[PDB]
Design a protein around this ligand. Structure first.
Ligand SMILES: Cc1ncc(C[n+]2c([C@H](O)CCC(=O)O)sc(CCOP(=O)(O)OP(=O)(O)O)c2C)c(N)n1
Ligand SMILES: Cc1ncc(C[n+]2c([C@H](O)CCC(=O)O)sc(CCOP(=O)(O)OP(=O)(O)O)c2C)c(N)n1
Ligand SMILES: [Mn+2]
Ligand SMILES: [Mn+2]
Lengths: 556, 556
């Protein structure tokens, strides 16, 4: 009977199926071809709905929600380039594990490759980047509802991590009153409609077995390297390493409290690398290590064995050491491989680390981005979370600051894109409802500028610091050629962000000194709104300061 | 010996090869992994270099340059999500034929799938959308330069239309003084370096043969449908149709002069469809037809044969008529199949078209987007070009205005995305150097908002009209459900664009009436800068006006 009615019945099964796998948040962009999905979603009381007009920002908004909530988040877009714009968030999700469920509306098969408007080839368009890809057939009652829900349940049930592409063709008519078309078809699922479980429960778990020789290896001289993990895992790793008597090299993304802070500096000292040569095992928990010195030490070190523990799959050691790749929840893994109190074997490095931090503290006064990074632990909102952008800020905080154990830090450090940091920050805030400090560079803020529209709706104060050093000053840190550097690398855009904030009715500060910065923060945390704080600094000071501190510490 | 040096020698070959196939423009985004490509490009004096920080916008900038220049345009980006951001422009280029050459830097094979920073799986990531895909090997002197240049020459020489993905892995070190590493390797190409031709000339032409029964068919009752084509082709098709005595239904994208204007209205009149039932042949030149009534007539008509002539490949008739799909340059095709002077056979449709335009003229006074569309022919810059955005603006101009024959119109009407219209307009302007009138909707301007950065550099005046009807009001034209319409379709953002203009130091007007609009136009054309003109209109008036005019004309 009614094609428009059956479309919506077909879509309703898809959306209800997702609710059985923990999907609560759904992000929707506008369109006509997506009508069946969007109307099914709007009518379903299980969902929290988010909307946005930029599908690239929408994908990153979903990414942020998933990142914090640790639950699958659904996305609906219409056919065409709308779908292509989801690629960046999907790729990042493939690397760091967020479960993004992309429901992409499509033209029906009879309107593909025939010059039809807004019709493109969508099945397989994300290549190997989704964990799962489902290309749904043209809706028909001749395919039973139990097949459709089973297909969804397989994809969601077996999803360890990463994105799922569900391509959803619908034929016109898309609009019209609902009649009973497809009602008996849906009712073939019986009381599944009132159930809270999937139709098909397929939920195999992926996990490495416990290492039976751990009690032998924990007696050796080891090093613990902590990369990205949960806030609670960071605290557990810190206690575990301390009990082992092993030095802990903690990333900015680890939330370990970084008991040997400024590793990007002291790892540059020969006394440190000499001491680390005594390590017979390295146990790394988490991944996406930030610092250049740490990545260089990892690459050069030659322990008998190198282990990486993390809940994402695949090789995670870019230096390809002999060793082990252990897939596990980090907290669970630590219970299975407990520490026993042993005397610490390091003597030189704890001293060097304190001296490194003292060197940074000596240079804390200048009103620059290096100093802001070093001091950032003074501006963290109480009971809040930090979102750190890419390029210099994550590098400077990692090298120069000591972040509190267990204080939540979030980032897009898988592919380290500068293309979705504001929209991601918005999702991070909405997911937890916590006060949020987000720090990004100027090109980063320009890239995702229209995500300021989203930041008009936050459930707690969000401070967005934009460090404006007029270009991508990471290319003043890298040894790029001087003659081509400004035009072809730095690409200064010579803007400020006061008018951007005004456009979206966001409070704005451009503090000129530390006192004005503290005043701006004091103002900002008072209300559940986003405040833009623009820190304008001399282009190359941050990069040069990092270089000078590396050199100073290397001579200790 | 020097990897950094050889990287650049390898890249230099790739870029020099491109110059032999007409590549003059190259668009570059910042990065480190792209260094060998970017330095090779910067050093090659054959190129005009464009830069931008948003890779999605960079792709659309290239699309605009290619759109106007009719030459291949190269793009360089670094590894990671930078690459994914090129997808929307690549997809649009696949549909409408722009030759985009995407040089995407990559990590070397040993750094893929091992948790390395900013490293993703890039070969094949654009699936079937490029016309050609090259996955270059890890650079080595053991592969001769003649292979590398021949591979490039094959891809460019055989390229009829659309994009080419050239994935370019480079291993570190990326930086360092240039030495003689790879010089003798390059010199194996001999005096090709001083030549102006490809190394391998492979340029087969793809073209349909003369239709030997054209003298039979040109005597029948025919209809000419004109879609997107060049400005010169538009003039030629108009004279050809007039000579044949066949009615010409001309799209806004056709530049035919639209002798039977307001087709979206008079095709709604049953007397017109009845007269058109007498057509024995339909000859369509160009594709991507704009109007709903035209698309519906195309779908319903049943001539003995339906022909589509266009220089792009594949089926272009979404109604799948019995007939012919003829691949040719439209101007060439018309010379091969010339018109014969014959008596016009339509009598009712010329009456209706006139009455339809009078109906529109009667409503010309209100300060609304429907009226702006109708009157836009009165505001076209002399010796300039029009860039029409997607959604209501293109529909309303097509339905309500009569554009002058041979006056150049540009658009992204392949996939009709609202995601790249400002950056595309910038490229359209830079390519021709002509005064440019660009018209887009508010969600469109927000989507590509940071492209205002690009519009700070235009070589002739560019007027950007932003029609602000507070949301995607095409969804007030479509029969979307009232209860969900605002939140899930229209998505009003409740913004103005005064601060956006101020941020990028662009002059701004918000005219309240026609006099103020004309004053704004007069100011704008005086300097080689972009002027933003925001037309704030009542949300649903445009859609409703179109609906009313359709009804009025249908009852004539
Ligand atoms: C979407 C995307 N496209 C381009 C890049 C490249 N890229 C970077 C990669 O780290 C650079 C390594 C590499 O290319 O190998 S950093 C960077 C500049 C950020 O400038 P900003 O003013 O915000 O901060 P600052 O530098 O601290 O002043 C860019 C533009 C990217 N990461 N993502
Ligand atoms: C990148 C991308 N993502 C989403 C869309 C969907 N889409 C459209 C398709 O025409 C709608 C058919 C369809 O979905 O089948 S029109 C439209 C809103 C335009 O709003 P604006 O304020 O600018 O203009 P107005 O409507 O005149 O007021 C959208 C958002 C798209 N085209 N491209
Ligand atoms: Mn910067
Ligand atoms: Mn609008």
């Amino acid at each position: 009977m009614s094609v428009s009615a059956f479309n919506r019945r077909w879509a309703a099964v898809i959306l209800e199926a997702l609710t059985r796998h923990g999907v609560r948040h759904i992000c929707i962009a506008p369109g006509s071809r997506s009508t069946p999905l969007t109307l099914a979603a709007a009518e379903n009381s299980a969902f929290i709905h988010h909307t946005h007009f930029d599908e690239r920002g929408l994908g990153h908004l979903a990414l942020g929600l998933a990142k914090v909530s640790k639950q699958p988040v659904a996305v609906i877009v219409t056919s065409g380039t709308a779908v292509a714009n989801l690629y960046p968030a999907l790729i990042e999700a493939g690397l760091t594990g967020e479960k993004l469920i992309l429901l992409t509306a499509d033209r029906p098969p009879e309107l593909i490759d025939c010059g039809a408007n807004q019709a493109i080839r969508q099945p397989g368009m994300f290549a190997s980047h989704p964990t799962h890809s489902i290309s749904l057939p043209r809706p028909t009652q001749d395919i039973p509802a139990r097949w459709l829900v089973s297909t969804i349940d397989h994809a969601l049930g077996t999803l360890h991590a990463g994105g799922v592409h569900i391509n959803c063709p619908f034929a016109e008519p898309l609009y019209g009153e609902m009649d009973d078309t497809g009602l008996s078809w849906q009712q073939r699922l019986g009381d599944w409609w009132q159930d809270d479980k999937p139709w098909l429960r397929e939920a195999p778990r992926l996990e490495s077995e416990k290492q039976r020789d751990w009690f032998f290896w924990r007696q050796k001289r080891g090093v613990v390297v902590a990369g990205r993990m949960s806030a609670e895992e960071g605290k557990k790793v810190a206690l575990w390493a301390q009990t082992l008597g092993w030095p802990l090299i903690g990333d900015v993304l680890s939330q370990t409290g970084q008991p040997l802070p400024c590793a990007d500096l002291w790892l540059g000292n020969a006394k440190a690398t000499s001491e680390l040569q005594q390590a017979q095992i390295v146990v790394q928990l988490g991944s996406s290590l930030t610092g250049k010195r740490l990545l260089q030490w990892q690459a050069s070190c030659e322990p008998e064995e190198y282990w990486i523990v993390d809940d994402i799959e695949g090789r995670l050691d870019p230096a390809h050491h002999r060793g082990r790749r252990l897939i596990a929840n980090i907290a669970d893994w630590l219970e299975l491989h407990p520490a026993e109190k042993r005397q610490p074997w390091c003597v030189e490095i704890p001293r060097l680390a304190e001296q490194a931090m003292q060197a940074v503290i000596a240079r804390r006064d200048a009103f620059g981005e290096a100093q802001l990074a070093h001091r950032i632990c003074d501006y963290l909102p109480e009971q809040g979370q930090l979102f750190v952008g890419n390029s210099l800020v994550v590098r400077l905080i990692d090298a120069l600051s000591q972040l509190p154990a267990g204080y939540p830090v979030y980032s897009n450090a898988g592919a380290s894109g500068i293309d979705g940091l504001l929209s991601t920050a918005a999702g991070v805030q909405r997911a937890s409802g916590k006060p949020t400090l987000a720090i990004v560079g100027d090109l980063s803020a320009l890239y995702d500028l229209n995500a300021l529209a989203l930041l008009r709706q936050v459930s707690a104060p969000l401070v967005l610091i934009v460090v404006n050093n007029n270009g991508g000053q990471i290319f003043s840190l890298l040894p790029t050629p001087q003659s081509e550097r400004e035009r072809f690398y730095l690409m200064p855009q010579n803007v400020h962000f006061e008018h951007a904030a005004a456009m979206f009715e966001l409070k704005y500060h451009r503090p000129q000194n530390w006192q004005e910065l503290e005043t701006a923060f004091a103002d900002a945390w008072r209300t559940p709104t986003t405040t833009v704080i623009e820190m304008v600094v001399n282009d190359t000071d941050g990069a040069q300061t990092l270089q000078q501190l590396l050199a100073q510490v290397s001579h200790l």
